[PDB]
């Protein structure tokens, strides 16, 4: 999340849908790299229900727009779970809060002019410091198109 | 061909300055035209082989796709003026191909109003006259007086069908009938306009007004322009067209 | 699409004289570039009588400037295309430098294909949004052929509305015109 | 300069009594007739310009102005011609390729000229 | 036969099963690309890619920035006719597969054939001539070609995400051509207004007028000296521009004779970089030419000046040695910004 | 029916629940207020106030699709029953779900409206979901035609 | 490399013929048979021949001279 | 019915910056990714922290978006207080003590809304929750209600920097302390959607398309972008009539030509025939009739 | 529209006169290298041979000695072994453009020379005995020999198209043949 | 509403009617995730209880048989996804908003420079949600001038 806040990140994230809701949920017993078991109290349980709650999301869905999806957990196991509770972090997503930016410690005072009014200048340890390194996915079908040959 | 040359002379380069470009006679196009095909087939997959006479045919519209003949005679780029026995084609280089428009007489024209009635009947305006009656001159449901002193019709006179066959159960054979090949455009080229030139000039002289002035000096100068011209007026609907190249017409 | 540099020198003394645009208060635009780089005609001569600032063709690169704000002569008459005589592209005596080729324009040259966008040059263009006289400052009246008639009053009323003065301080450079209708009665 | 052209008449003044007479090919006439041959030989004529889009019918090089918003009639009209493009515009001769007596291709033009000159 | 009336145009002339008629014989000279095929004809390119954008902060105007990573992308058969009369490339096959290779010496040779031929760019919207421009290429290895500043009006960008020109002049004539009108340096001034196009838009007129300005009078404004050492107290301490009145022996060799040089000692007082840029500049105009705040405005019309005194090549090394000096002393003042460099007067409080 | 009653209003009919018929009433009405316009009676309508729109719904939208395929359906339905009404088959003699199939695709693809779901942010993503525009069948019929809009 | 072109636009003064006039002296080069008579510092024909005109010897005049005098000497 | 089957493969592609990358900031403001130097150019700050992203300054004013000094003035206060509770961290001060540190920086300001440390948060709730706040201060702001300049100026006092800001520093080229001792902070970039990599285009000679032999097909894979009509006219307005006629007719589709002017390239001789155009010969060919319009020039 | 559309040797035809004339050659040296190139089979080998193309000219200054010489430089240009004629000896230029540091390179050469013959049969044991070489001395020999640019282009030298009009067609609706 | 307005069916003079009873909407096919990833149109079939009745003939009403047991199915209906997304041929598309003017007839001017004779006129325009659009225009003329459609 960006440093700075302007108080509708969470709900954002809440809104957009992508994580996973705790709908109904007590508490995050068996949770995996893609398993989470999750079992809610005997009250939330409801009746006829173990109130044992399984995800299973698909991990790093290539995005319409060639990017990348992945559902990232924030909870193990074992642990006393709200219900309609945020499971696991979809992209630009970090502590439930959709921020797609990262804020980095600058200064603002034209330099050896090596950059113009519409320029970027920025150092060698940030540039290792793999700050927005993209992850793109891109797809290639293949079909088996039956011929009388 | 010693070959020495024709791979020379197949590149060649003009000055291609001051280009020309207007109207002709049928000659030229009769020069323009290479051969004749028949059949409307584009291409089949029966044998996957050329059509005869038909869309881009064999010895029309330019060479083959290679030196080697469509029926296989003298298949070879090295044969120069061998002609197949099987079938009569450049056995060349395919720019020809591209350089090889037919044409066809037929002998029989028609109305070339996408000129004659350009915008407001450009061609038409020249003429002037009877613009509209000279652009139904044709139909060839008319005959037309073309000529007969001994009948009661000018050469220049408008006779319908019924009104030339009236004509005829009258006055005999004392009166003519122009249709068909350009109609009465045809007795109209056989015609000259130096003397309705020298009556447009005589008319703009005298009949001077807002409307008498306007549409016959207009006449005149087309007169005046046109015999500067002086090309084959028959040209507007001709006895020869162009056939389309086997590379002038794709796929 | 007609543009060409052929003709070296038009020959013909006709022309266009350029004048200061004296345009609303005062000189809008004074007359010390509108046609520095340019031959005029004979037409340049110095503001003392007999006295002749340039030849007939002298492009004014810049003494001539000098010469011409000193002698505070506001026009001289001075060759131009169309009137450049060539029926032909134009004369080169009447086509100039004009740009930072600091000789005249080359034979063959093309400044309306210089130009042809020289005015479209303002894409980003910006539309779709008698009795109150006053004098600048010191000047003359300069009436410029007003019909003084017997008014009402003691003075002589402007018979014709062409009632255009010329606040001219010290010399031929002028400040203000206050041109006044036919309407109207002179005051001064 | 270009916002006027083709100016119009009235005296034949045995050129010819007519009315949009190009205002450089009167003068250049008017230079080698009256002053040359025939003084008597003088027309009168009035100067004219118009919008541009107006201008835009007339022009020279038989290719151009044909292209530039119908053709079909234009075509038609210059048949009826038969006149001579003449690769009057250097944007005709670009079209064609000639060479536009341009910068370097007013040389190439003119070394053309000099050569076509001795044949 | 007729122009029209053929493909059924009589009556019936509509193509088999197609609503729509086929191209009739009535129209089928004109198909309708004709005139408009020649226009798009004049409105189409193939080839020699182009597009990017970036900033040249080095690489003062008589140059042109690059990418080498495209690069020779098209100068492959330039670069494989080097090679194979080189012999690196003893057949056609042979340089495909060192090119497939790569090779260092590929490099060089591309290397060598670009300092011999510059190449010509133009920018994303076609305004003016001042768009296009001819300029020495050099590889960059960059994704975006990057342009010295000096173009910066020429092509009407704001260094933003734009796309370039790239242009190969493979004639003889047309590199001449290009080095002679599309020549950077062969344009100065806009040839349309006449004015001088090329002007320091940017901070580095700031970096001058800093130069050229006290901020009221600093430690040691009254130093007295001769010049010599100014850059090294300047840089180091002892004086500042924001020093008022520092003396300083004033020697300028004016052009005063006709074509010829005359120099004179003066003592101007001034600041610390007003003195320093005026040795920066050429001999001709005066040092109060030079001395003054260094205005923007005062700068193009300096550049004027000795545009109309000295001349082309003076003029452009001049322009990039300011361009470079702006960037320097730009860098010296860091001048960043905030909230309280705008001060509300409270007075507005009682007016309103 | 709101149409009606936007058309009671205006003439100012108390009873604004009404049918989508029409009646020479109101024409007589609407044409005497137009002459009172005419002559002074109010001032025009206005396009830009809030008041003089009426959006449309996806859902609507779908109903819209889903009745005017059964307009059509409707009308099947009665041409078959009109020849050889003498049967007693079941009512499938003329249920075609292909023709409901795809009108429901031509409504919910073949639309303009309709497009790719665009997450490359989650709150793009939402955005794009919380679209509010004049263009399709409707609105912003054509592109040119106006500028105070 | 030469960074302004000016000296050439001095030396002709029409500043059309010095660009024709370079094209001129390098296709000669290239081809063969002419030596530069300007000393080579590794740089582009066009370049040496550009030099050697603004040097003032190399123009329209002296290149068709030479070519008449070689021209009759054969 | 056409394939009996269909196989898709799907591949990711991993991505770092690259030269004249696009930057982003939800302050409005863009910037195109210049240059990166060594560490060593950053100039170093008094705790020697060298220069991380340098703006120019020239740009702001004629934004007037205060936004970027916004955004550093609380980025910069972001990053202090989490400097400092690391600092207690490596120095694992008391999680009380923490906790209080904590609350006196959250308490203060002008009275928005209600949080109370020490109190709510469990003990081990409180050390998760200042684990998970390792990298900054937690902020929100109304979007038109939030906090007091001044107590931004305050909060950078209470975070032990400076209130406007304003901080010199030394070189990193060679180590001049730079006068007007700058303000700065945590300012957020973000990227476009378009990337440098991408918009890489270029061609030499590409594959013809099937019509008129041009470069396309709707594949961005040597294509060749068409000209502008006035683009052509200020070619034009070059007077480079070579230079034209080469645009016209070497940069076009017919590689018919291209023989000759590929051995031309290779043999150095860049020279091209006059003849006549490609046009010109299709035209000539498809010739309604002959030519009355003169035939003779230069 | 004027010509369709197509790519360099798009039937297996073009390709080869486009890398000749991107190559130095005469007049009569490009009209020799066009004769063996448009007289090329679907198979890619030169259908008719430098003697057919001459008779077909009927030219002198086109010998054969001129059109072997042109078919020698465009022996392999684009791709190896074009206009190929009988290939056994374009098998031989594929050998010998192919490094000749392959192992068994004699062997391949020894076999392709004038051991077709035995190969023919596939009676490697009987080729090896009338070689007098062990037998599968040469296998890595003979492997290299079965991939050595059979017809060149061989596929791509096959343009052969697919051309068919059955009077009738068998749907087969639901058996019991639907004609 | 919308099945209500197309339920009345009847012969033409057939003394046949159609009807229906009530909609058995089918269940979905594919998991939203398994429709994804095997890219179907995710939808929910639709199966509408038809009623056929078939009247005896000159009996008034006399109805001789009932089909009312036909589940006419027409087609799949595409959920609107719990996160909202359209599934159209699988794809997470999203039809944009419409917003119309409000049915009804419009008190608009149509005056100025339109008249282009200094004339106000009065013009007002009817915008029906169905049916042809129209307006009335006053002339310069002092005359009323209708349009239709």
């Given at each position: 999340?960006p440093?700075?806040?302007?108080?509708m990140?969470?709900?954002?994230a809440?809104?957009?849908?992508?994580?996973?809701?705790?709908?109904?949920?007590?508490?995050?017993?068996?949770?995996?790299?893609?398993?989470?078991?999750i079992?809610?109290?005997?009250?939330?349980?409801?009746?006829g229900?173990?109130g044992?709650?399984?995800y299973?999301?698909?991990?790093?869905?290539?995005?319409?727009?060639?990017?990348?999806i992945?559902?990232?957990?924030?909870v193990?196991?074992?642990?006393?779970?709200?219900?309609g509770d945020?499971?696991?972090?979809?992209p630009?997503?970090?502590?439930?809060?959709?921020?797609?930016?990262?804020?980095?410690?600058?200064?603002?005072?034209p330099?050896?002019?090596?950059?113009?009014?519409?320029?970027?200048?920025?150092?060698?340890?940030?540039?290792?410091?793999?700050?927005?390194?993209?992850?793109?996915?891109?797809?290639?079908?293949?079909?088996?198109?039956?011929?009388?040959? | 061909?010693d070959?020495?040359?024709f791979?020379?002379?197949?590149?060649?380069?003009?000055?291609?300055?001051?280009?020309?470009?207007?109207?002709?006679?049928?000659?030229?196009?009769?020069?323009?035209?290479?051969?004749?095909?028949?059949?409307?087939?584009?291409?089949?997959?029966?044998?996957?082989?050329?059509?005869?006479?038909?869309?881009?045919?064999?010895?029309?519209?330019?060479?083959?796709?290679?030196?080697e003949?469509?029926?296989?005679?003298?298949?070879?780029?090295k044969?120069?003026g061998?002609?197949?026995?099987?079938?009569?084609?450049?056995?060349?280089?395919?720019?020809?191909?591209r350089?090889?428009?037919?044409?066809?007489?037929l002998?029989?024209?028609?109305?070339?109003?996408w000129?004659?009635?350009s915008?407001?009947?450009?061609?038409?305006?020249?003429?002037?006259?009877?613009?509209?009656?000279?652009?139904?001159?044709?139909?060839?449901?008319?005959?037309?007086?073309?000529?007969?002193?001994?009948?009661?019709?000018?050469?220049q006179?408008?006779?319908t069908?019924?009104?030339?066959?009236?004509a005829?159960?009258?006055?005999?054979?004392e009166?003519?009938?122009?249709?068909?090949?350009?109609?009465?455009?045809?007795?109209?080229?056989?015609?000259?306009?130096?003397?309705?030139c020298?009556?447009?000039?005589?008319?703009?002289?005298?009949?001077?007004?807002?409307?008498?002035?306007?549409?016959?000096?207009?006449?005149?100068?087309?007169?005046?322009?046109?015999?500067?011209?002086?090309?084959?007026?028959?040209?507007?609907?001709?006895?020869?067209?162009?056939?389309?190249?086997?590379?002038l017409?794709?796929? | 699409?007609?543009?060409?540099?052929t003709?070296d020198?038009?020959g013909?003394?006709?022309?266009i004289m350029?004048?200061?645009?004296?345009?609303?208060?005062?000189?809008?635009?004074?007359?010390?570039?509108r046609?520095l780089?340019?031959?005029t005609?004979?037409?340049?001569?110095?503001?003392?009588?007999a006295?002749?600032?340039?030849?007939?063709?002298?492009?004014?690169?810049?003494?001539?400037?000098?010469?011409?704000?000193?002698?505070?002569?506001?026009?001289?008459?001075?060759?131009?295309?169309?009137?450049?005589?060539?029926?032909?592209?134009?004369?080169?005596?009447?086509?100039?430098?004009?740009?930072?080729?600091?000789?005249i324009?080359?034979?063959?040259?093309?400044?309306?294909?210089?130009?042809?966008?020289?005015i479209?040059?303002?894409?980003?263009?910006?539309?779709?949004?008698?009795?109150?006289?006053?004098?600048?400052?010191?000047?003359?009246?300069?009436?410029?052929?007003?019909?003084?008639?017997?008014?009402?009053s003691?003075?002589?009323?402007?018979?014709?509305?062409?009632?255009?003065?010329?606040l001219?301080?010290?010399?031929?450079r002028?400040?203000?015109?206050?041109?006044?209708?036919?309407?109207?009665?002179?005051?001064? | 300069?270009?916002?006027?052209?083709?100016?119009?008449?009235?005296?034949?003044?045995?050129?010819?009594?007519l009315?949009?007479?190009?205002?450089?090919?009167?003068?250049?006439?008017?230079?080698?007739?009256?002053?040359?041959?025939?003084?008597?030989?003088?027309?009168?004529?009035?100067?004219?310009?118009?919008?541009?889009?107006?201008?835009?019918?007339?022009?020279?090089?038989?290719?151009?102005?044909?292209?530039?918003?119908?053709?079909?009639?234009?075509?038609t009209?210059?048949?009826?011609?038969?006149?001579?493009?003449?690769?009057?515009g250097?944007?005709?001769?670009?079209?064609?390729?000639?060479?536009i007596?341009?910068?370097?291709?007013?040389?190439?033009?003119?070394?053309?000229m000099?050569?076509?000159?001795?044949? | 036969?007729?122009?029209?009336?053929?493909?059924?145009?009589?009556?019936?002339?509509?193509?088999?099963?197609?609503?729509?008629?086929?191209?009739?014989?009535?129209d089928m000279?004109?198909?309708k690309?004709?005139?408009?095929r020649?226009?798009?004809?004049?409105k189409?390119?193939?080839?020699?890619?182009?597009?990017?954008?970036?900033?040249?902060?080095?690489?003062?105007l008589?140059?042109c920035?690059?990418?080498?990573?495209?690069?020779?992308?098209?100068?492959?058969?330039?670069?494989y006719?080097?090679?194979?009369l080189?012999?690196?490339?003893?057949?056609?096959?042979?340089?495909?597969?060192?090119?497939?290779?790569?090779?260092a010496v590929?490099?060089?040779?591309?290397?060598?054939?670009?300092?011999?031929?510059?190449?010509?760019?133009?920018?994303?919207?076609?305004?003016?001539?001042?768009?296009?421009?001819?300029?020495?290429?050099?590889?960059?290895?960059?994704?975006?070609?990057?342009?010295?500043?000096?173009?910066?009006?020429?092509?009407?960008?704001?260094?933003?995400?734009?796309?370039?020109?790239?242009?190969?002049?493979?004639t003889?004539?047309?590199?001449?051509?290009?080095?002679?009108?599309?020549?950077?340096?062969?344009?100065?001034?806009?040839?349309?207004?006449?004015?001088?196009?090329?002007?320091?838009?940017?901070?580095?007129?700031?970096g001058?007028?800093?130069?050229?300005?006290?901020?009221?009078?600093?430690?040691?404004?009254?130093?007295v000296?001769?010049g010599?050492?100014?850059?090294?107290?300047?840089?180091?301490?002892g004086?500042?521009?924001?020093?008022?009145?520092?003396?300083?022996?004033?020697?300028?060799?004016?052009?005063?004779a006709?074509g010829?040089?005359?120099?004179?000692?003066?003592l101007?007082?001034?600041?610390?970089?007003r003195?320093?840029?005026?040795?920066?500049?050429?001999?001709?105009?005066?040092?109060?030419?030079?001395?003054?705040?260094?205005?923007?405005?005062?700068?193009?019309?300096?550049?004027?000046?000795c545009?109309?005194?000295?001349?082309?090549?003076?003029?452009?090394?001049?322009?990039?040695?300011?361009?470079?000096?702006?960037?320097?002393?730009?860098?010296?003042?860091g001048?960043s910004?905030?909230?309280?460099?705008?001060?509300?007067?409270?007075?507005?409080?009682?007016?309103? | 029916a709101?149409?009606?009653?936007?058309?009671?209003?205006?003439?100012?009919?108390?009873?604004?629940?009404?049918?989508?018929?029409?009646?020479?009433?109101?024409?007589?009405?609407?044409?005497?207020?137009?002459?009172?316009?005419?002559?002074?009676?109010?001032?025009?309508?206005?396009?830009?106030?809030?008041?003089?729109?009426?959006?449309?719904?996806?859902?609507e939208?779908?109903?819209?699709?889903?009745?005017?395929?059964?307009?059509?359906?409707?009308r099947?339905?009665?041409?078959?029953?009109?020849l050889?009404?003498?049967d007693?088959?079941?009512?499938?003699?003329?249920?075609?779900?292909k023709?409901?199939?795809?009108?429901?695709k031509?409504?919910?693809?073949?639309?303009?409206?309709?497009?790719?779901?665009?997450?490359?942010?989650?709150?793009?993503?939402?955005?794009?979901?919380?679209?509010?525009?004049?263009?399709?069948p409707?609105?912003?019929?054509?592109?040119?035609?106006?500028?105070?809009? | 490399?030469?960074?302004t072109?000016?000296?050439?636009?001095?030396?002709?003064?029409?500043?059309?013929?010095?660009?024709?006039?370079?094209?001129?002296?390098?296709?000669?080069?290239?081809?063969?048979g002419?030596?530069?008579?300007v000393?080579?510092?590794?740089?582009?024909?066009?370049?040496?021949?550009?030099?050697?005109?603004?040097?003032?010897?190399?123009?329209?005049?002296?290149?068709?001279?030479?070519?008449?005098?070689?021209?009759?000497?054969? | 019915?056409?394939?009996?089957?269909?196989?898709k493969?799907?591949?990711?592609?991993?991505?770092?910056?690259?030269?004249?990358?696009?930057?982003?900031?939800?302050?409005?403001?863009?910037?195109?990714?210049?240059?990166?130097?060594?560490?060593?150019?950053?100039?170093?700050?008094?705790?020697?922290?060298?220069?991380?992203?340098?703006?120019?300054?020239?740009?702001?004013?004629?934004?007037?978006?205060?936004?970027?000094?916004?955004?550093?003035?609380?980025?910069?206060?972001?990053?202090?207080?989490?400097?400092?509770?690391?600092?207690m961290?490596?120095?694992?001060?008391?999680?009380?003590?923490?906790?209080?540190f904590?609350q006196?920086?959250?308490?203060?300001?002008?009275?928005?809304?209600?949080?109370?440390?020490?109190?709510?948060?469990?003990?081990?709730?409180?050390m998760?929750?200042?684990?998970?706040?390792?990298?900054?201060?937690?902020?929100?702001?109304?979007?038109?209600?939030?906090?007091?300049?001044?107590?931004?100026?305050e909060?950078?006092?209470?975070?032990?920097?400076?209130?406007?800001?304003?901080?010199?520093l030394?070189?990193?080229?060679?180590?001049?302390?730079?006068?007007?001792?700058?303000?700065?902070?945590?300012?957020?970039?973000?990227?476009?959607?378009?990337?440098?990599?991408?918009?890489?285009?270029?061609?030499?000679?590409?594959?013809?398309?099937?019509?008129?032999?041009?470069p396309?097909?709707?594949?961005?894979?040597?294509?060749?972008?068409?000209?502008?009509?006035?683009?052509?006219?200020?070619?034009?307005?070059?007077g480079?009539?070579?230079?034209?006629?080469?645009?016209?007719?070497?940069?076009?589709?017919?590689?018919?030509?291209?023989?000759?002017?590929?051995?031309?390239?290779?043999?150095?001789?860049?020279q091209?025939?006059?003849?006549?155009?490609?046009?010109?010969?299709?035209?000539?060919?498809?010739?309604?009739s002959?030519?009355?319009?003169?035939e003779?020039?230069? | 529209?004027?010509?369709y559309?197509?790519?360099?040797?798009?039937?297996?035809?073009?390709?080869?006169?486009?890398?000749?004339?991107?190559?130095?050659?005469?007049?009569?040296?490009?009209?020799?290298?066009?004769?063996?190139?448009?007289?090329?089979?679907?198979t890619?080998?030169?259908?008719?041979?430098?003697?057919?193309?001459?008779?077909?000219?009927?030219?002198?200054?086109?010998?054969?000695?001129?059109?072997?010489?042109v078919?020698?430089?465009?022996?392999?240009?684009?791709?190896?072994?074009?206009?190929?004629?009988d290939?056994?000896?374009?098998?031989?230029?594929?050998?010998?453009?192919?490094?000749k540091e392959?192992?068994?390179?004699?062997?391949?050469?020894?076999?392709?020379s004038?051991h077709?013959?035995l190969?023919?049969?596939?009676?490697?044991r009987?080729?090896?005995?009338?070689?007098?070489?062990?037998?599968?001395?040469?296998?890595?020999?003979?492997?290299?020999?079965?991939?050595?640019?059979?017809?060149?282009?061989?596929?791509?030298?096959?343009?052969?198209?697919?051309?068919?009009?059955?009077?009738?067609?068998?749907?087969?609706?639901?058996?019991?043949?639907?004609? | 509403?919308?099945?209500?307005?197309?339920?009345?069916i009847?012969?033409?003079?057939?003394?046949?009617?159609?009807?229906?009873?009530?909609?058995?909407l089918?269940?979905?096919v594919?998991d939203?995730?398994?429709?994804?990833?095997?890219?179907?149109?995710?939808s929910?079939?639709?199966?509408?209880?038809?009623?056929?009745v078939?009247?005896?003939?000159?009996?008034?009403?006399?109805?001789?048989?009932?089909?009312?047991?036909?589940?006419?199915?027409?087609?799949?209906?595409?959920?609107?996804?719990?996160?909202?997304?359209?599934?159209?041929?699988?794809?997470?598309?999203?039809?944009?908003?419409?917003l119309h003017?409000?049915?009804?007839?419009?008190?608009?001017?149509?005056?100025?420079?339109?008249?282009?004779?200094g004339?106000?006129?009065?013009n007002?325009?009817?915008?029906?949600?169905?049916?042809?659009?129209?307006?009335?225009?006053?002339?310069?003329?002092?005359?009323?001038?209708?349009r239709?459609?």
């Open positions: 999340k440093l700075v806040g302007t108080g990140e969470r709900a954002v809440v809104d957009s849908g992508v994580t996973a809701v705790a709908k109904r949920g007590g508490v995050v017993q068996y949770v995996d790299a893609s398993r989470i078991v079992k809610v109290n005997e009250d939330e349980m409801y009746p229900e173990a044992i709650d399984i299973n999301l698909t991990k790093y869905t290539r995005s319409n727009q060639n990017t990348c992945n559902q990232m957990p924030c193990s196991l074992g642990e006393p779970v709200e219900r945020v499971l696991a972090d979809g630009s997503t970090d502590l439930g809060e959709l921020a797609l930016g990262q804020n980095m410690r600058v200064a603002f005072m330099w050896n002019g090596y950059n113009f009014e519409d320029s970027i200048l920025v150092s060698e340890r940030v540039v290792q410091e793999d700050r927005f390194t993209t992850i793109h996915i891109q797809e290639l079908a293949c079909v088996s198109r039956d011929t009388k040959l | 061909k070959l020495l040359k791979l020379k002379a197949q590149t060649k380069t003009e000055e291609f300055d001051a280009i020309k470009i207007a109207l002709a006679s049928p000659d030229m196009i009769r020069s323009w035209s290479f051969g004749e095909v028949k059949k409307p087939e584009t291409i089949n997959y029966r044998t996957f082989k050329p059509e005869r006479d038909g869309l881009f045919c064999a010895r029309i519209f330019g060479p083959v796709k290679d030196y003949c469509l029926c296989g005679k003298y298949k070879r780029l044969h120069r061998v002609i197949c026995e099987k079938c009569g084609v450049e056995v060349t280089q395919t720019k020809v191909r350089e090889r428009m037919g044409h066809i007489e002998a029989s024209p028609t109305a070339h109003i000129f004659l009635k915008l407001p009947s450009r061609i038409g305006l020249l003429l002037d006259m009877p613009l509209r009656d000279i652009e139904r001159v044709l139909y060839f449901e008319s005959y037309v007086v073309i000529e007969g002193g001994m009948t009661n019709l000018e050469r006179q408008i006779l069908e019924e009104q030339y066959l009236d005829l159960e009258e006055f005999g054979d009166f003519d009938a122009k249709m068909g090949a350009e109609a009465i455009q045809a007795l109209l080229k056989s015609m000259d306009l130096e003397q309705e020298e009556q447009l000039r005589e008319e703009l002289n005298e009949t001077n007004s807002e409307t008498k002035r306007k549409k016959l000096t207009k006449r005149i100068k087309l007169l005046e322009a046109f015999v500067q011209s002086g090309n084959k007026p028959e040209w507007m609907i001709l006895t020869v067209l162009p056939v389309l190249p086997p590379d017409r794709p796929l | 699409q007609d543009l060409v540099v003709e020198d038009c013909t003394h006709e022309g350029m004048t200061p645009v004296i345009e609303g208060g005062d000189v809008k635009e004074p007359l010390r570039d046609v780089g340019r031959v005609a004979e037409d340049v001569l110095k503001p003392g009588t006295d002749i600032l340039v030849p007939r063709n002298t492009l004014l690169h810049e003494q001539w400037c000098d010469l011409l704000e000193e002698n505070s002569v506001d026009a001289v008459k001075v060759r131009s295309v169309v009137s450049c005589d060539t029926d032909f592209g134009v004369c080169a005596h009447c086509y100039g430098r004009d740009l930072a080729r600091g000789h324009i080359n034979k063959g040259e093309a400044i309306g294909v210089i130009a042809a966008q020289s479209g040059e303002p894409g980003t263009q910006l539309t779709m949004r008698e009795s109150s006289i006053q004098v600048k400052n010191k000047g003359s009246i300069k009436l410029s052929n007003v019909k003084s008639v017997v008014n009402s003691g003075k002589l009323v402007i018979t014709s509305r062409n009632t255009e003065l010329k001219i301080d010290e010399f031929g002028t400040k203000e015109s206050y041109k006044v209708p036919y309407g109207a009665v002179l005051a001064k | 300069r270009q916002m006027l052209r083709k100016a119009t008449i009235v005296n034949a003044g045995s050129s010819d009594f009315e949009g007479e190009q205002v450089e090919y009167s003068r250049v006439k008017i230079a080698n007739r009256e002053l040359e041959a025939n003084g008597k030989v003088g027309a009168t004529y009035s100067r004219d310009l118009l919008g541009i889009t107006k201008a835009s019918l007339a022009t020279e090089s038989f290719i151009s102005a044909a292209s530039f918003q119908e053709t079909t009639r234009v075509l009209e210059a048949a009826v011609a038969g006149k001579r493009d003449e690769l009057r250097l944007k005709e001769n670009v079209i064609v390729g000639r060479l007596p341009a910068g370097t291709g007013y040389a190439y033009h003119q070394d053309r000099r050569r076509r000159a001795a044949g | 036969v007729d122009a029209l009336l053929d493909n059924g145009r009589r009556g019936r002339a509509i193509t088999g099963s197609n609503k729509r008629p086929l191209k009739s014989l009535a000279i004109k198909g690309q004709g005139r408009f020649q226009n798009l004809l004049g189409r390119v193939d080839y020699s890619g182009r597009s990017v954008i970036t900033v040249g902060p080095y690489l003062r008589h140059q920035g690059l990418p080498k990573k495209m690069a020779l992308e098209l100068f492959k058969p330039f670069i006719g080097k090679l194979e080189r012999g690196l490339a003893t057949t056609i096959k042979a340089a495909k597969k060192m090119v497939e290779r790569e090779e590929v490099w060089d040779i591309l290397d060598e054939v670009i300092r011999e031929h510059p190449v010509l760019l133009n920018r994303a919207p076609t305004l003016h001539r001042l768009g296009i421009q001819a300029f020495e290429p050099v590889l960059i290895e960059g994704k975006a070609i990057q342009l010295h500043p000096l173009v910066c009006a020429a092509y009407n960008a704001d260094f933003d995400g734009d796309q370039m020109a790239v242009h190969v002049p493979l003889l004539e047309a590199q001449l051509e290009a080095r002679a009108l599309m020549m950077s340096t062969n344009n100065i001034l806009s040839p349309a207004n006449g004015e001088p196009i090329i002007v320091p838009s940017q901070d580095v007129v700031l001058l007028y800093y130069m050229t300005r006290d901020c009221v009078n600093a430690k040691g404004e009254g130093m000296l001769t010599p050492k100014e850059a090294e107290r300047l840089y180091r301490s004086l500042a521009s924001l020093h008022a009145r520092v003396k300083v022996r004033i020697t300028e060799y004016e052009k005063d006709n010829e040089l005359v120099a004179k000692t003066s101007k007082d001034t600041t610390v970089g003195a320093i840029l005026w040795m920066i500049v050429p001999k001709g105009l005066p040092y109060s030419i030079v001395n003054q705040a260094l205005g923007k405005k005062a700068i193009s019309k300096m550049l004027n000046t545009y109309r005194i000295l001349g082309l090549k003076p003029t452009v090394i001049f322009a990039d040695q300011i361009m470079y000096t702006g960037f320097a002393y730009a860098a010296r003042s001048a910004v905030g909230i309280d460099d705008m001060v509300i007067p409270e007075k507005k409080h009682e007016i309103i | 709101v149409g009606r009653m936007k058309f009671n209003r205006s003439l100012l009919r108390e009873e604004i629940e009404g049918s989508g018929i029409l009646s020479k009433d109101d024409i007589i009405d609407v044409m005497k207020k137009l002459i009172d316009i005419r002559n002074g009676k109010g001032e025009v309508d206005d396009i830009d106030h809030l008041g003089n729109r009426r959006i449309r719904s996806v859902g939208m779908a109903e819209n699709q889903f009745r005017v395929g059964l307009v059509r359906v409707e099947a339905v009665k041409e078959r029953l009109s050889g009404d003498l007693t088959l079941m009512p499938q003699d003329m249920i075609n779900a023709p409901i199939s795809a009108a429901v031509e409504f919910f693809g073949s639309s303009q409206l309709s497009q790719f779901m665009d997450q490359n942010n989650p709150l793009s993503e939402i955005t794009h979901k919380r679209r509010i525009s004049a263009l399709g409707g609105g912003l019929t054509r592109e040119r035609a106006g500028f105070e809009v | 490399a030469r960074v072109v000016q000296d050439a636009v001095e030396k002709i003064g029409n500043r059309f013929d010095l660009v024709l006039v370079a094209a001129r002296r390098a296709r000669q080069m290239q081809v063969g002419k030596d530069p008579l000393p080579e510092e590794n740089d582009k024909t066009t370049v040496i021949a550009l030099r050697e005109i603004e040097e003032g010897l190399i123009n329209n005049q002296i290149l068709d001279v030479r070519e008449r005098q070689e021209q009759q000497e054969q | 019915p056409g394939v009996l089957k269909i196989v493969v799907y591949l990711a592609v991993k991505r770092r910056i690259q030269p004249g990358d696009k930057m982003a900031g939800r302050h409005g403001n863009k910037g195109v990714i210049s240059k990166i130097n060594p560490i060593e150019d950053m100039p170093y700050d008094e705790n020697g922290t060298p220069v991380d992203i340098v703006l120019n300054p020239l740009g702001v004013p004629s934004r007037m978006n205060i936004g970027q000094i916004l955004e550093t003035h609380l980025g910069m206060a972001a990053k202090g207080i989490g400097d400092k509770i690391n600092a961290l490596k120095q694992q001060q008391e999680v009380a003590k923490l906790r209080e904590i006196r920086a959250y308490d203060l300001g002008a009275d928005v809304r209600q949080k109370v440390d020490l109190s709510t948060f469990s003990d081990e709730e409180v998760r929750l200042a684990e998970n706040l390792r990298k900054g201060m937690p902020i929100a702001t109304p979007v038109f209600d939030g906090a007091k300049e001044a107590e931004i100026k909060l950078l006092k209470l975070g032990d920097l400076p209130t406007s800001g304003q901080i010199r030394y070189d990193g080229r060679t180590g001049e302390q730079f006068e007007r001792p700058v303000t700065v902070g945590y300012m957020y970039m973000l990227k476009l959607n378009h990337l440098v990599d991408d918009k890489m285009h270029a061609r030499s000679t590409g594959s013809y398309s099937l019509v008129t032999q041009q396309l097909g709707g594949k961005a894979q040597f294509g060749g972008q068409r000209f502008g009509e006035m683009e052509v006219w200020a070619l034009e307005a070059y480079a009539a070579y230079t034209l006629q080469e645009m016209l007719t070497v940069k076009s589709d017919d590689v018919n030509g291209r023989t000759k002017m590929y051995k031309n390239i290779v043999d150095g001789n860049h091209m025939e006059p003849g006549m155009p490609e046009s010109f010969n299709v035209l000539l060919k498809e010739i309604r002959l030519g009355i319009n003169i003779l020039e230069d | 529209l004027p010509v559309q197509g790519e360099t040797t798009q039937t297996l035809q073009d390709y080869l006169m486009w890398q000749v004339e991107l190559t130095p050659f005469t007049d009569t040296d490009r009209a020799i290298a066009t004769s063996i190139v448009d007289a090329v089979d679907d890619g080998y030169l259908t008719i041979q430098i003697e057919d193309i001459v008779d077909s000219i009927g030219d002198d200054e086109i010998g054969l000695e001129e059109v072997e010489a078919l020698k430089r465009i022996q392999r240009f684009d791709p190896v072994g074009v206009a190929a004629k290939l056994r000896d374009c098998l031989l230029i594929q050998l010998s453009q192919f490094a392959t192992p068994w390179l004699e062997e391949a050469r020894l076999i392709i004038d077709l013959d190969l023919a049969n596939h009676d490697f009987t080729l090896m005995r009338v070689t007098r070489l062990k037998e599968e001395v040469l296998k890595e020999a003979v492997n290299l020999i079965q991939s050595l640019d059979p017809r060149p282009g061989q596929s791509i030298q096959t343009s052969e198209p697919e051309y068919v009009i059955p009077d009738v067609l068998v749907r087969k609706v639901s058996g019991r043949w639907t004609v | 509403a919308a099945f209500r307005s197309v339920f009345p009847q012969s033409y003079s057939g003394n046949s009617e159609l009807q229906y009873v009530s909609y058995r089918g269940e979905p594919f939203v995730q398994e429709c994804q990833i095997r890219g179907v149109t995710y929910a079939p639709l199966r509408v209880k038809l009623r056929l078939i009247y005896e003939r000159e009996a008034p009403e006399g109805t001789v048989k009932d089909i009312k047991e036909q589940e006419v199915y027409m087609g799949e209906i595409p959920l609107m996804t719990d996160n909202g997304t359209f599934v159209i041929n699988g794809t997470e598309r999203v039809i944009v908003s419409q003017r409000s049915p009804g007839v419009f008190f608009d001017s149509d005056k100025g420079k339109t008249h282009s004779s004339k106000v006129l009065y007002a325009r009817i915008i029906p949600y169905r049916g042809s659009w129209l307006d009335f225009e006053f002339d310069p003329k002092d005359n009323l001038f209708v239709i459609d």
